[PDB]
Amino acid sequence: QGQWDKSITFGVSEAWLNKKKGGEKVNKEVINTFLENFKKEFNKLKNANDKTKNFDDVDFKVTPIQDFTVLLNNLSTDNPELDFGINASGKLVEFLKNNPGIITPALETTTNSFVFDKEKDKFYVDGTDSDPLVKIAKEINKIFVETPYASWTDENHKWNGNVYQSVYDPTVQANFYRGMIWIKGNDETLAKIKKAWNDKDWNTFRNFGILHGKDNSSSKFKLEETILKNHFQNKFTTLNEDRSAHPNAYKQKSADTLGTLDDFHIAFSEEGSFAWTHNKSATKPFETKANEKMEALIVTNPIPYDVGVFRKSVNQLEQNLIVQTFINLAKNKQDTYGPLLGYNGYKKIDNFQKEIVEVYEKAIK
Numbered sequence: 097q098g099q100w101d102k103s104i105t106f107g108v109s110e111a112w113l114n115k116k117k118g119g120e121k122v123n124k125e126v127i128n129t130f131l132e133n134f135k136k137e138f139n140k141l142k143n144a145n146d147k148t149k150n151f152d153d154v155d156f157k158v159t160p161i162q163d164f165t166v167l168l169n170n171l172s173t174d175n176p177e178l179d180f181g182i183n184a185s186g187k188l189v190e191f192l193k194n195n196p197g198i199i200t201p202a203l204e205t206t207t208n209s210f211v212f213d214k215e216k217d218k219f220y221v222d223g224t225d226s227d228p229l230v231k232i233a234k235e236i237n238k239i240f241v242e243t244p245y246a247s248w249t250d251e252n253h254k255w256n257g258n259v260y261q262s263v264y265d266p267t268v269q270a271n272f273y274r275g276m277i278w279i280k281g282n283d284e285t286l287a288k289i290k291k292a293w294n295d296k297d298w299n300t301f302r303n304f305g306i307l308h309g310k311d312n313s314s315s316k317f318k319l320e321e322t323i324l325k326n327h328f329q330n331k332f333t334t335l336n337e338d339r340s341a342h343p344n345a346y347k348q349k350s351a352d353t354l355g356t357l358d359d360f361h362i363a364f365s366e367e368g369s370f371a372w373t374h375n376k377s378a379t380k381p382f383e384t385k386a387n388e389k390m391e392a393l394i395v396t397n398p399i400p401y402d403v404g405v406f407r408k409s410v411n412q413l414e415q416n417l418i419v420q421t422f423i424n425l426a427k428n429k430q431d432t433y434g435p436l437l438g439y440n441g442y443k444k445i446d447n448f449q450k451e452i453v454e455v456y457e458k459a460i461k
């Protein structure tokens with residue numbers, strides 16, 4: 097059933113942990129009270145239960161990790177110095193396809209729903225104006241274009257240091273997230289792009305210039321690739337092959353810089369990424385030339401939110417207490433770390449294949 101481990105180490109993003117807010121390291125103070133709250137609730141549950149109270153009390157710590165490849169690789173070695181971490185779901189499903197059973201997924205995060213995307217079960221249909229993913233994109237434009245983002249204020253949109261709270265409905269927890277496709281130009285260019293989209297003219301559409309993230313990203317590459325393949329039926333095989341033949345039509349850069357590239361007019365991003373991007377930042381995110389606008393074209397199919405995974409030999413009883421400690425901390429509003437990453441709630445995973453793998457595979461098909 098695995099070994100009881102009296103020391104539990106959470107892997108966290110190195111870049112996040114050393115985050116200096118005025119030379120200070122706030123996140124480090126944030127994670128220590130989280131850890132202190134976690135230890136006390138965990139050991140309370142453990143000692144309250146007859147099956148686990150005779151095991152040693154457990155101490156919790158964190159360790160900084162470079163990136164998610166080191167997290168998954170490190171966990172798969174099943175070394176007690178690193179026991180648990182939370183990873184994007186698509187990347188994890190891809191890892192476990194290669195090397196099945198090597199690590200153990202156990203909990204699912206949830207995030208406050210966007211006011212414009214409260215229902216999971218909207219999928220691509222045909223990319224026309226009655227397509228449910230196009231309808232969500234129109235709702236996003238009402239929020240981001242009609243009431244222009246550049247003029248939002250911290251008080252207007254309830255900025256809390258973390259996110260713009262006015263674009264969220266915390267009463268509804270979303271089981272999922274989506275990517276989205278942005279388009280940018282003056283009036284004539286926007287119309288030309290929508291025409292190429294409606295005419296399913298791939299070559300013209302792609303030649304407007306596509307900004308994308310890394311090849312292994314779900315929400316900045318793969319989910320969009322799926323929509324494009326389904327909309328422009330049989331016109332290219334994969335975005336990587338297409339790029340190979342048309343390298344100047346593609347650039348790896350964040351969508352919020354799209355306004356600064358005169359040569360590019362299409363960009364991939366996570367849905368609603370402006371919601372956690374302060375419009376007053378030095379980089380001037382989402383800014384565009386005077387007579388140009390940036391707007392949403394369509395969003396993607398949905399995939400699960402991030403997943404917490406264990407090295408394989410942590411005792412099963414211990415795993416379940418840790419899972420329930422995350423859930424109760426969030427309920428008691430004692431989770432000071434999660435909300436900073438977008439994790440506003442937690443759920444136990446009862447069936448990985450049904451709840452995570454199948455949901456992801458249907459979205460990229």
Ligand SMILES: Cc1ncc(C[n+]2csc(CCOP(=O)(O)OP(=O)(O)O)c2C)c(N)n1
Pocket residue numbers: 184185186187258259273312313314315316366372401402435436437438439
């Ligand atoms: C406060 C806050 N809310 C939400 C986010 C966004 N977010 C957190 S976890 C997650 C899901 C996994 O996304 P990502 O790690 O970018 O993996 P990818 O889609 O690139 O594979 C997202 C979109 C954030 N960075 N900050």
Ligand SMILES: [Ca+2]
Pocket residue numbers: 101103104105175176177178179
């Ligand atoms: Ca350990």
Ligand SMILES: [Cl-]
Pocket residue numbers: 145146147
């Ligand atoms: Cl119990």
